[PDB]
Amino acid sequence: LRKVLISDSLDPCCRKILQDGGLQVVEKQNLSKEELIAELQDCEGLIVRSATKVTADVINAAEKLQVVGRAGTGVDNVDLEAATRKGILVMNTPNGNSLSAAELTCGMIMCLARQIPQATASMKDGKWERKKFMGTELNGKTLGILGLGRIGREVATRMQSFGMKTIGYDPIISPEVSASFGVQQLPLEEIWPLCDFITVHTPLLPSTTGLLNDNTFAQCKKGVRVVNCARGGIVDEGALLRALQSGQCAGAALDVFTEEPPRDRALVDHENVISCPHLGASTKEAQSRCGEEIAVQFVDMV
Amino acid sequence: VLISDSLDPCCRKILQDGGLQVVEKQNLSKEELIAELQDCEGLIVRSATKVTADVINAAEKLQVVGRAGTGVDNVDLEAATRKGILVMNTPNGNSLSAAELTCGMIMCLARQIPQATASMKDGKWERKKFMGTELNGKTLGILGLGRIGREVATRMQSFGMKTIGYDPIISPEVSASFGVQQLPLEEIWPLCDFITVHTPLLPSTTGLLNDNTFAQCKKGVRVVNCARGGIVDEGALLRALQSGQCAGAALDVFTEEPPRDRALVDHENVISCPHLGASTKEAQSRCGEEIAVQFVDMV
Ligand SMILES: CC(=O)NS(=O)(=O)c1ccc([C@@H](C)NC(=O)c2cc(-c3ccccc3)nn2C)cc1
Numbered sequence: 001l002r003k004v005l006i007s008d009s010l011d012p013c014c015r016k017i018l019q020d021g022g023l024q025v026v027e028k029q030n031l032s033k034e035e036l037i038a039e040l041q042d043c044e045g046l047i048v049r050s051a052t053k054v055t056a057d058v059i060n061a062a063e064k065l066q067v068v069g070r071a072g073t074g075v076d077n078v079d080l081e082a083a084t085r086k087g088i089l090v091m092n093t094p095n096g097n098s099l100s101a102a103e104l105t106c107g108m109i110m111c112l113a114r115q116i117p118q119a120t121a122s123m124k125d126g127k128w129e130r131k132k133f134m135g136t137e138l139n140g141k142t143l144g145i146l147g148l149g150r151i152g153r154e155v156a157t158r159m160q161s162f163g164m165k166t167i168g169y170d171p172i173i174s175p176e177v178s179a180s181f182g183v184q185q186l187p188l189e190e191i192w193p194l195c196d197f198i199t200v201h202t203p204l205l206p207s208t209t210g211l212l213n214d215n216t217f218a219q220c221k222k223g224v225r226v227v228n229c230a231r232g233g234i235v236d237e238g239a240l241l242r243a244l245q246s247g248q249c250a251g252a253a254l255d256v257f258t259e260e261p262p263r264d265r266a267l268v269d270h271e272n273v274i275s276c277p278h279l280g281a282s283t284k285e286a287q288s289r290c291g292e293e294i295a296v297q298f299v300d301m302v
Numbered sequence: 303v304l305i306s307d308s309l310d311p312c313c314r315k316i317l318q319d320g321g322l323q324v325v326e327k328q329n330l331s332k333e334e335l336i337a338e339l340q341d342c343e344g345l346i347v348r349s350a351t352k353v354t355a356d357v358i359n360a361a362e363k364l365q366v367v368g369r370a371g372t373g374v375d376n377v378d379l380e381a382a383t384r385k386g387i388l389v390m391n392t393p394n395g396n397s398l399s400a401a402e403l404t405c406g407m408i409m410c411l412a413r414q415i416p417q418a419t420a421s422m423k424d425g426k427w428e429r430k431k432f433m434g435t436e437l438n439g440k441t442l443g444i445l446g447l448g449r450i451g452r453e454v455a456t457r458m459q460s461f462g463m464k465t466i467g468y469d470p471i472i473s474p475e476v477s478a479s480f481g482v483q484q485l486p487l488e489e490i491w492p493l494c495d496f497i498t499v500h501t502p503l504l505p506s507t508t509g510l511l512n513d514n515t516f517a518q519c520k521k522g523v524r525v526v527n528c529a530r531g532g533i534v535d536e537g538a539l540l541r542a543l544q545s546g547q548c549a550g551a552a553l554d555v556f557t558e559e560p561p562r563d564r565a566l567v568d569h570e571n572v573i574s575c576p577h578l579g580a581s582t583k584e585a586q587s588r589c590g591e592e593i594a595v596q597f598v599d600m601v
């Protein structure tokens with residue numbers, strides 16, 4: 001309404017847009033439970049990234065709190081049940097990270113195709129083992145895109161320029177609409193045996209938990225490569241390890257995990273697995289857009 | 303024609319349908335190379351067969367030595383030239399693989415996927431460290447606009463990159479047809495966020511990226527060399543990475559292969575590959591086809 005607190009390291013545009021809207025802004029970081037509660041005592045708004053934990057205790061203590069903004073995707077650090085219970089509106093910026101997640105996904109596909117992380121590691125270990133490496137050309141290969149939201153769409157248009165056949169599935173996006181962005185929709189069971197590469201870009205739901213599992217992996221072409229830059233758990237982690245161990249899956253690229261940081265190291269340590277510490281939204285540009293989009297939403301409210 | 307190395311079965315197809323008689327077999331010794339090359343005008347090789355001065359001089363009927371790939375380091379060029387033997391290669395067969403790796407490299411420079419992988423493999427979860435940059439809206443300068451240069455251009459245009467470049471052989475109209483606006487070299491350096499080289503290695507291209515050109519670059523330029531070692535002056539690249547003038551470099555090639563000076567390979571902002579630009583089975587098969595076509599073009 002009048003005072004907003006930013007409790008994580010956000011792009012400076014966020015403060016600027018809120019102040020342009022007429023709001024007072026406090027910019028703090030790495031605050032503990034009581035530190036955050038004290039700052040919030042005169043704030044009607046709170047903007048977080050992922051580090052600040054908007055727990056039940058935080059929500060209940062901040063009496064003037066009306067809105068909780070998340071500069072990004074995934075409101076896991078916010079207690080939605082406690083927020084709904086206190087009449088606090090919860091906002092996020094899903095759109096702001098779209099290009100960054102799509103670019104990383106394409107980066108991962110290329111990394112799997114040419115074993116770039118493994119090659120760099122080999123080189124940094126003072127080795128020159130050309131004969132140990134053999135990559136694959138993306139041109140003429142089939143990329144399966146499960147989830148045809150904005151991220152899935154951006155991935156498709158970039159990989160089409162490589163000469164990849166882009167096929168996929170989304171129960172919301174019609175075959176006519178996907179055709180307009182070059183994605184041929186087929187029923188799931190038809191997708192699995194055709195893909196050389198599979199990339200998942202769906203929200204995490206009961207219907208999408210373990211979408212890639214022992215049964216669907218068995219339906220895949222031998223040597224399939226899997227990319228998960230969406231949500232941990234869409235690709236059943238145990239089933240993936242089994243697929244990598246048998247050779248059913250020739251490689252996997254993971255940005256997300258069921259537990260972050262993952263305590264089970266079997267996937268990360270696998271020689272055919274490349275990974276990142278959830279870097280999908282980690283670009284100067286994505287952070288700027290998220291900061292802007294959350295500040296605009298807060299100004300729209302007042 | 304004799305095929306001395308492990309090649310695609312389509313090599314024989316084009317050679318035979320062209321009218322020539324072929325002999326295959328691989329893993330042939332020094333004397334097994336002196337003999338067997340008895341009565342054929344042509345010889346087709348890859349990387350394993352080392353076409354040395356001794357082999358060349360022993361085969362008096364030899365007129366052409368074909369290489370299924372780029373780079374004739376395994377062929378004694380001086381020795382073939384002495385006997386009047388033509389040495390041909392297939393750089394076009396490797397075009398797609400080299401362009402694909404380059405694009406992979408650009409992506410790795412913006413997001414540091416190889417470094418993030420290594421960090422993850424050491425049990426680390428370093429989010430702040432690997433905060434990257436978006437390719438959309440960035441300028442990619444492409445120096446050398448042959449088939450590799452143009453293939454890189456069209457792929458990176460789908461990422462919303464502004465593709466500029468220079469090639470003294472390629473006309474501004476030809477480059478404009480694949481969305482590359484040509485500008486003189488001195489105008490390219492201050493505009494780029496990323497610079498990638500796809501030129502042959504010649505005195506005109508040796509050290510094309512040097513201390514002077516790096517000082518003309520925008521602070522934090524990311525550099526890619528998937529062409530030939532020496533195009534980017536390695537000493538100048540290291541100075542640029544040290545000051546921060548260059549924020550990162552992706553190298554598939556080195557002046558010396560393997561590189562003995564590990565300072566670039568060991569830099570945290572450098573990603574590298576042991577010359578994998580042509581290391582796909584698809585490039586190998588295509589090179590196999592292209593060299594057979596060239597041998598058939600004898601008339
Ligand atoms: C911006 C951005 O794309 N965000 S996002 O979270 O990736 C994203 C992805 C997709 C959508 C819409 C188009 N689709 C769904 O919500 C959807 C897809 C699936 C599904 C099930 C099984 C197999 C494949 C797909 N089930 N559902 C409910 C919205 C957001």
Ligand SMILES: CC(=O)NS(=O)(=O)c1ccc([C@@H](C)NC(=O)c2cc(-c3ccccc3)nn2C)cc1
Binds near residue numbers: 393445448450471507
């Ligand atoms: C298939 C494939 O593309 N091979 S390739 O080796 O990349 C390749 C690259 C380019 C070409 C032709 C088109 N261009 C040249 O030969 C050229 C470019 C330059 C130059 C000098 C300074 C700055 C920028 C450019 N000088 N020369 C002599 C042929 C092959």
